[PDB]
Symmetry: D2
Subunit: 237 residues, 4 copies
């Protein structure tokens, strides 16, 4: 199926599938069942920022999500991505709502990838940065309910004309170009991403989350992957 | 018909179609007959560097080609590219051989695009850098004879395994993601590109050159644009 | 004395010294008497952004100042900076108030410098970006009334504890490291800066302006250079 | 006493002071006795590349040294640098020779620091890149025997004009601007550095190595830290 590495901003505790019982940031290596989570004090209606960093020297995938107020949640996991992901991938943002819902608004998203082979100055790099998203954002593949342009933002999941989030929605945006994430003869593979999000819900509890992910290039939304599956996984195995 | 903006490193004078009677650098606005040229002393078998720069504020497209010994040619052209290019483009390198030939070897290629909309820190950006090209370079669209991987280089045109370039070859490499080159709502759009090239004619009678170009996203090698048309234009109008 | 190249955001028309009779953006080459101005619809109390770009291929210094609302003023001037500035310089922000006053608040400031010599990949570069300024900003030399830290901003000129700007104030912030702006054997010298500013005045008219400047390294505020002189020039010659 | 964080490319085993009995790479936290080393097969007379990376999220300092043939050594150390370094530092390269010698030639050096405070797009950044060092390199502080300009390189230690390195030489180059490496209010601090070096011993008995270091801003070469102390430490404690 798809090969997924993701950092999830999981807004809803599905302890049924191994979520801790609080909103959490998590590192997901080919399963929605995070290898590692940290409690995340999600702030309904605040703008937050997630930073995801990997270096292939230290082989440690780290992520922080924070709110200006100051609250901040951190998670790291040792993983050799050489062993997990295909050589070439796509990188994206995914979000979902289920029975409970939230806006999954991306205000900005940036990504830098570096790939060095041994041979002096031999870095390849990709960087993109979106601070504004237009109606027709041709460097993004939008999947599912993802739209761009409304207030210059990427709405990952359905929002009504009056800003009201809809449930059972899933959507993703992938950067258009494949990303070379490792090679046979790589000295340093390394990447980082940042995105700023606004998760707002009128419900008793927001759900389900936003994920930064890295997939096989031809990745698409697994069917049924709204709600707790986060646009990322066909099931909770 | 494609819409092409190019900077050509034109190694062969086709005075026939308006070339000056020497190797030149030129800025091509929708025609192989450059709007502006400068004399260029192509150094056969040496690694050269071309830098292309444009910002939407000064509305000047500028290019330099230089070699390590310090010899360099420069050309600029005042042009408002919103009047020329679609809002969304691909960027690429193109090369051809005709009756005469040369290696059109790209050793590295990088590009930066920035687009700022009205709205305060509101920059979108694309950057990529290839200092090494792999046999399977999925973030490049390879067209015609273009191959990558051969010594970690991009050979835009056909070169036999002994290192000998072939006549009537065209090839191009376009970056995979479309590039947002302008918008209505744009305070600043700007881009710059650099590539290093090894043009070598074992005759020391080189043809036809290399171009950095910007095209409509669906651009392909026009029919019969080997030789002097540099993989860019259907004819010499 | 000092060698100054500046882009001025001149908020006050001193037609006595050659200002056009409206707020204006201007390019100043060793004189406060701009070589080139454009009318600038200054918006008292709005956050604006100025972008300054130079490439040494095109030898055209350009600047745009804009407000999110959408208003935007542009100016360019052909100048070989090789001939104006010393090889090594400092880059800074300057502002002043006089009889009339305004806050000269910098919210952010970034700068990129590139210097290539002929010799393939041989780029030197400096980039810095400040989105927040702390109390003790050791990579900035603060001159005159310039302070950092109050709300994470750089206040270039005196503001009272309640946010009220003071007249006859001058201040500057220079990036700490000297910048190599040209060399003998430079293929491309090129730089750009961005800053976002908030100019607010309670007076009948704001004054006097903010300038992005490039100076000799040992540059200091010319005495008496409050008001129309903008922290930049000892006189209006 | 200076506060030093270093990554050493240590070419000479002083088993005396805890070095392993082979050339190694190591992470030095306030002591020349590395907290972590990895075997390093220094290739005499070849141009190597060292990459150093740290982010404050994963809290792992990682380094690789490699040569073009693909041989590479890697070392990581879990460290929270806020516990080690002052908030404001300088970064630099250091080298020494002692009884044994080697060229400590730096062909290029680059560094990127990012510091994000609580506050939403709130990143401060410093980047510099030297691919060519000039005789008068005003953005470097040169200490001890360090000179620049000689072949566009930085010779950290004394080399005679025939190309022959000298014993008991120390030198360093610190980037001129202080670097904000952490703050209380910091969501993410991270940095990475790269330098390429040519260590050559015309005996093929090299000493003593090169280090990338981060120090208190006022750091100078400690007394008698030629040889094994690498210009970094006053003694071998
Ligand atoms: Ca969940
Ligand atoms: Ca031609
Ligand atoms: Ca004025
Ligand atoms: Ca040693
Ligand atoms: Mn979860
Ligand atoms: Mn031509
Ligand atoms: Mn003026
Ligand atoms: Mn050691």
């Amino acid at each position: 199926a798809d090969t997924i590495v993701a950092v999830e901003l999981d807004t809803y505790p599905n302890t049924d599938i191994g979520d801790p019982n609080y909103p959490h940031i998590g590192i997901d290596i080919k399963s929605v069942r995070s290898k590692k989570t940290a409690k995340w004090n999600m702030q309904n209606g605040k703008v937050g920022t997630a930073h995801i960093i990997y270096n292939s020297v230290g082989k440690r995938l780290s992520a922080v999500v924070s709110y200006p107020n100051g609250d901040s949640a951190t998670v790291s996991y040792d993983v050799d991505l050489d062993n997990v992901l295909p050589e070439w991938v796509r990188v994206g943002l995914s979000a979902s709502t289920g029975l409970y819902k939230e806006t999954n608004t991306i205000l900005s998203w940036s990504f830098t990838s570096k790939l060095k082979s041994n041979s002096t100055h031999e870095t390849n790099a990709l960087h993109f940065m979106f601070n504004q998203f237009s109606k027709d954002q041709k460097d993004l593949i939008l999947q599912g309910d993802a739209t761009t342009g409304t207030d210059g933002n990427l709405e990952l999941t359905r929002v009504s004309s009056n800003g009201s989030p809809q449930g059972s929605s899933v959507g993703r945006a992938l950067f258009y170009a494949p990303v070379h994430i490792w090679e046979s003869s790589a000295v340093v593979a390394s990447f980082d991403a940042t995105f700023t999000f606004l998760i707002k819900s009128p419900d008793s509890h927001p759900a389900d989350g936003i994920a930064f992910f890295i997939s096989n290039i031809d990745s698409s939304i697994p069917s049924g992957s709204t709600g707790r599956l986060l646009g990322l996984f066909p099931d909770a195995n």
